[PDB]
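Entry: M7r1
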Amino acid sequence: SQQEFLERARQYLEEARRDLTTRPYYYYVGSDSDGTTREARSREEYAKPEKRVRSLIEELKNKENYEIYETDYSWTETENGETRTHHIYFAYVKKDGKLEALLLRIESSGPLTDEETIEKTTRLLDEIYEKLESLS
């Protein structure tokens, strides 16, 4: 059922929305149809490498009853020597009403400053949370 993964990613999204304007962070969480969930609350925990997930995605894009969803918002700004990067990737694959793979990557090199980007990232994290509640 991957309920563990569900709760872990819910908590990660909560903390991301909470610390959007507070502190850098890095959250990874990935589960497959076998249920093997791997997390990474620190950067170097997953900086050492999702392959089968994207391979199955691309294969299923081009047999049936599949519901696939993926979102990826990434923006970087390298100015004055500072390379502030931010990245959010979410994706779930569901073959024949059976969750085959779920993946979440949230990454923030530091606190956000653009009000527009803050609102966009909050809205996207909330959308991912609302979808994750539906995937239970």
